[PDB]
């Protein structure tokens, strides 16, 4: 499921009365195209989401390092019972929790919803776009009807 | 105090803030936003 | 988020320098007509709604929806440390009653 949406229409006095208001599902700004967005663009999304990995693996690699200093500093802040390996462990899954929140969000901003803040990417060019479709390619449209 | 005094809280839209002809030119573009017009805000063709 | 916002700083930064070499790619793949002006100003539009949506994924994950993974995190608790706020910090609960 790519794309889902809901609309009502306008004023009226007419309940039963359909109207086009679904049709915000397409829209776009289009004042000045003179360019493509970089965005649609595959190739684009996918350097800005390996720099974006880069860096939380250097932000993965940075906390297990700052690990250690911080364990000394609970060390003299929790008393005796401190437990120098059981402190590492909870605080490991925790980074490693955090680090794949970090990945996860980062394909969410470059792959999944990298039209959510763009007006001149449609909620359908996008969510076509999230796996490299075209308007082409919706081959068929259900119709109410 | 207005709405109290007169009983006219409700105001019914009798018409929507697009013409029929900018209805969907409206509905198409995210950056199209109401101005003012006598007093009234409604959707014009400059903004679309 | 702080060191999360420096980062994204400087994607700004970056960004917009590597555009002057973007841009003179774009001036010889688009023929005659390209304009720099025009070009520099749609994109530093993109760059700039683009790290505006980086910040606020950055302070959606660590202001406001940090708690999402976290099980040790409930969504009450998460929610009101949100705010800085404790669970005692729920003063009153309208009963359905």
Redesign the interface.
């Known amino acids: 499921l790519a794309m889902t949406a809901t609309a009502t229409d306008k004023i009226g006095r007419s309940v039963p009365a359909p109207g086009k208001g679904i049709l915000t599902t397409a829209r776009e700004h289009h004042g000045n195209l003179k360019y493509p967005s970089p965005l649609l663009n595959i190739k684009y999304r996918k350097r800005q989401l390996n720099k974006r990995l880069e860096q939380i693996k250097s932000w993965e690699e940075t906390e297990l390092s700052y690990l250690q200093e911080e364990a000394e500093l609970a060390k003299e802040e929790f008393g005796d019972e401190f437990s120098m390996h059981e402190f590492l462990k909870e605080r490991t899954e925790e980074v490693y929790r955090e680090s794949k929140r970090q990945v996860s969000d980062a394909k969410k901003q470059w792959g999944n919803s990298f039209y959510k803040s763009d007006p001149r990417i449609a909620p359908l060019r996008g969510a076509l776009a999230a796996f490299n479709l075209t308007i082409d390619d919706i081959g068929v449209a259900s119709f109410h009807g | 105090h207005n709405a109290i005094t007169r009983n006219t809280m409700f105001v019914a839209?009798?018409?929507?803030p697009?013409s029929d002809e900018l209805?969907?030119p409206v509905?198409?573009?995210?950056?199209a936003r109401v101005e003012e017009n006598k007093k009234k805000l409604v959707f014009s063709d400059k903004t679309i």
Do not use: N
């Not at chain 2, 839209?13 to 929507?16: L, V, Y």
């Not at chain 2, 509905?27 to 950056?31: C, V």
């Open positions: 839209k009798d018409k929507a697009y209805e969907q509905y198409l573009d995210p950056l």
